[PDB]
């Protein structure tokens, strides 16, 4: 045993993994073994989901988060998101699970049997954290790997069956994307969109053409960026701006993942394009809009003139104006007028919700969908009792959107803590005071008093 | 075929369990490493063969 | 459901997802065996 | 004999017993009394 106790490593058992900072072979084992855990979960969880899956029930009634990810890619589903073939789900699960053994093997080997350090064994695989060119080279390899990944999504969408399109004319269906958006003014225009209401930054992406073309751009940007980083070494300004150490690099990645986690939270909460409501359930905004639609339909069937119906406050009971004048659903859902969904858009005209269309053109399928969504709003208790806090037991439901938003907020938040923890520590360690103040060289004692 | 598939998948599970315990134990054991090395190679080859066997036989039972 | 040919391995599939948690716990068993040195 | 059964085994077995009993308690939340059914 070398470096495997506190006295020799300087790190207590609870910070045991910090013993790995300068042991590249064991550290590679740690990473490969960990990747095996991720892949293990993706496989085993999928198989669990499939084993419990009742095809005629909506996925979102079944506590599924992974099968919806597979379905969104166009595998296993047909028109309206109906499940036509569960075998693709099985394949994804099995192959991941099988693959996890291989990674597990490599991880366990490198961690406890292979060379503890890689530097004497291999110039290529060995590395020093302070070697800036080697660090950017490994980064470059991974950027290429990621760029290829993004192009695989493009490949599925364009050449291998397509993706599930909730917006498909005539109703939601799998659709091959023939004409992806390449126009950089559209693709990069998303990035400059305000994150606030009615805009929603990149979370606003509302068609698959933009999604696919975005990944073409990202695929090529990552590959180009990767090549760039293999062939160059950090510039002077970059060298003076950053801390160069394993812990510093960890901290930058922690900050990045925190940011990403927060973005994914808002994505699953608001976006119904790459998270189709057919699989994930309605968004909070959607279900609220759908309740107003439901009672507009019901009450209009009963004889109500929904355009002229004055509510208790003086605002329209069913329909009112947005602050810029568009016709929108009334009641509290006034806040959700930015919502856009395939069941609702047919009633929308240039001025907003069209009274003529509302009076004449609401189809039973729209009524069904609104009723489905109103009663599958993403509200529920920790023990999975669906609905508001005051509901009695009966409906076993918490929306996949709630599970996914909450989990990723928790994760993103702790990863921000982790960033601050490691970024702060990396600064202190590089400057040489991470273990405490030198009693004989206490900086404050050499400074003038403040007063 | 169904009985072949059944036993091949059963063997895959059993071997997996044996490897799960055996590989780490062998990797961290002082003696019998020469004996261990070849068994791990044999275990791995057989494990891969069984995956493919279960993979193919899948289509003649489903 | 899983394909019928796999039905017997169903109770095993039900328990696999928890395995990652067991890895975290295993680290503590191991550390206890080496006295948390 | 004071020291024969290693402490790490006692901790692991004791811990596993706690998980089993608490796990049983959670199972009971979904079955029989207090299950809402």
């Amino acid at each position: 045993a070398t470096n495997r106790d506190q006295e020799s490593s300087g790190f207590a058992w609870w910070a045991g993994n910090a013993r790995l900072i300068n042991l590249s072979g064991k550290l590679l084992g740690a990473h490969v073994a960990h990747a095996g855990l991720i892949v293990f979960w993706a496989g085993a969880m999928t198989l669990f989901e499939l084993a419990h899956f009742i095809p005629e029930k909506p996925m979102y009634e079944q506590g599924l988060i992974l099968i919806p990810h597979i379905a969104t890619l166009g595998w296993g589903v047909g028109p309206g998101g109906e499940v036509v073939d569960t075998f693709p789900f099985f394949v994804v699960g099995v192959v991941h699970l099988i693959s996890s053994a291989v990674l597990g093997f490599g991880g366990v080997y490198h961690a406890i049997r292979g060379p503890e350090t890689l530097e004497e064994y291999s110039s290529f695989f060995g590395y020093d954290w302070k070697d800036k060119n080697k660090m950017t080279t490994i980064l470059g390899f991974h950027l290429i790997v990621l760029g290829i990944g993004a192009l695989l999504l493009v490949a599925k969408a364009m050449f291998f069956g397509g993706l599930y399109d909730t917006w498909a004319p005539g109703g939601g269906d799998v659709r091959v994307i023939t004409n992806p958006t390449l126009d950089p003014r559209v693709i990069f225009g998303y990035l400059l969109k305000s994150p606030f209401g009615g805009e929603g930054w990149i979370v606003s992406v509302n068609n698959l053409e933009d999604v696919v073309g975005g990944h073409i751009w990202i695929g090529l940007i990552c590959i180009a960026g990767g090549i760039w980083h293999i062939l160059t070494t950090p510039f002077g300004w970059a060298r003076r701006a950053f801390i160069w150490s394993g812990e510093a690099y960890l901290s930058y990645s922690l900050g990045a993942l925190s940011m990403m986690g927060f973005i994914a939270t808002c994505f699953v909460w608001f976006n119904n394009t790459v998270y189709p409501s057919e699989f994930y359930g309605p968004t909070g905004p959607e279900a609220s809009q759908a309740q107003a639609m439901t009672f507009l339909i019901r009450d209009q069937k009963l004889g109500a003139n929904v355009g002229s119906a004055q509510g208790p406050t003086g605002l329209g009971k069913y329909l009112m104006r947005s602050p810029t004048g568009e016709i929108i659903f009334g009641g509290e859902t006034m806040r959700f007028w930015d919502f856009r969904g395939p069941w609702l858009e047919p009633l929308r005209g240039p001025n907003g919700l069209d009274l003529n269309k509302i009076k004449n053109d609401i189809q039973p399928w729209q009524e069904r969908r609104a009723a489905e969504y109103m009663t599958h709003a993403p509200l529920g208790s920790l023990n999975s009792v669906g609905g508001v806090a005051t509901e009695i037991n009966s409906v076993n439901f918490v929306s996949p959107r709630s599970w996914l938003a909450t989990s990723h907020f928790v994760l993103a938040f702790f990863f921000l803590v982790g960033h601050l923890w490691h970024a702060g520590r990396a600064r202190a360690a590089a400057a040489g005071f991470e273990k405490g103040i030198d009693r004989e060289s206490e900086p404050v004692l050499s400074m003038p008093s403040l007063d | 075929m169904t009985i072949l598939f059944q036993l091949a998948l059963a063997a895959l599970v059993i071997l997996s369990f044996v490897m799960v315990i055996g590989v780490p134990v062998a990797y961290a054991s002082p003696q019998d490493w020469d004996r261990s090395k070849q068994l791990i190679f044999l275990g791995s080859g057989l494990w891969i063969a069984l995956v493919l066997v279960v993979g193919v036989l899948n289509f003649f039972v489903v | 459901k899983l394909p019928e040919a796999y039905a017997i391995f169903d109770p095993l599939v039900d328990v696999l997802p928890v395995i990652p948690v067991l890895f975290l716990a295993l680290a503590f068993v191991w550390q206890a065996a080496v006295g948390f040195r | 004999e004071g020291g024969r059964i290693p402490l790490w085994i006692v901790a692991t077995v004791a811990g596993m017993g706690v998980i089993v009993i608490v796990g049983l308690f959670f199972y009971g939340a979904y079955a029989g009394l207090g299950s809402s059914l």
Partner: peptide
Amino acid sequence: EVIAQLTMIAMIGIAGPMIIFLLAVRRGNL
């Protein structure tokens, strides 16, 4: 069936501590 599930988890559950126990007895590189 609950017994089959419990049997599976018990065998998977023991596997980890077993690895450690076997290595401790064999004076392995823990």
